[PDB]
Ligand binder design. Sequence first.
Ligand SMILES: C[C@](O)(CS(=O)(=O)c1ccc(F)cc1)C(=O)Nc1ccc(C#N)c(C(F)(F)F)c1
Lengths: 9, 249
Amino acid sequence: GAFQNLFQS
Amino acid sequence: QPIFLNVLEAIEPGVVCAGHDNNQPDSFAALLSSLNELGERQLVHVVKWAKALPGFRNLHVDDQMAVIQYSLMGLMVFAMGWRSFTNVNSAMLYFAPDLVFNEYRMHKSRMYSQCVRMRHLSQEFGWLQITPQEFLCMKALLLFSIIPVDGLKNQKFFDELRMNYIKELDRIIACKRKNPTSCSRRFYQLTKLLDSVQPIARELHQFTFDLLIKSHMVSVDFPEMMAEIISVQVPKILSGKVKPIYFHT
Ligand SMILES: C[C@](O)(CS(=O)(=O)c1ccc(F)cc1)C(=O)Nc1ccc(C#N)c(C(F)(F)F)c1
């Protein structure tokens, strides 16, 4: 979700 | 050198501003919308900080994400208690340079009870004379202070990391050494202080959960990312599925 994609960049 | 302490100071994040309109009169919706936005901003910096911590990449990617989310509130509350101590000697709550709470705001936000607990925590830094070094080591230990009761994916590496952060904080505690009355007691004091972050983060979790639930009916905006964390991870804490690791009983 939204946090994993933050975690990604 | 003091390798470990160097790293903690090197990665410690800068000032994060909330973007709040300090010339509008205070309403609940504005204060809470500014806090939700600041919450997301500080979360972005917490991810970067955390990923740079010694050993953090020993953890399974999934344990990494989970401890960030679970420990977010305790972390922000602790950093904020320190900022209030250093910036205003604990008279007000220094969420951000552009979002300082006086008693009127504490009350308009409808989080007075939680705010008063936070101010107390802030005074404690004074009372105990916490050094900037002890602060940094304690804050680092808080990212490893809250886990699912059913354990993590690679729990053994977590256990080792945490043990090693406990060690570093013991190595660094402030005392005249030829007396472990100070050193053994200092540790006691600091671990009591760390424990007390948890009920406060729990009250704040409870209030934010409730606010998300009724948010449409009170005009508070949650960033999409905060909405997901509140609805997906927050309730594991409130339901007892994820729990703090306490020093004392
Ligand atoms: C009400 C709320 O905005 C909720 S939130 O930021 O969306 C949030 C959502 C999920 C979490 F796991 C933690 C925090 C909040 O707790 N904000 C907030 C923002 C900044 C700071 C600081 N500093 C704090 C506090 F911890 F210090 F209270 C709290």
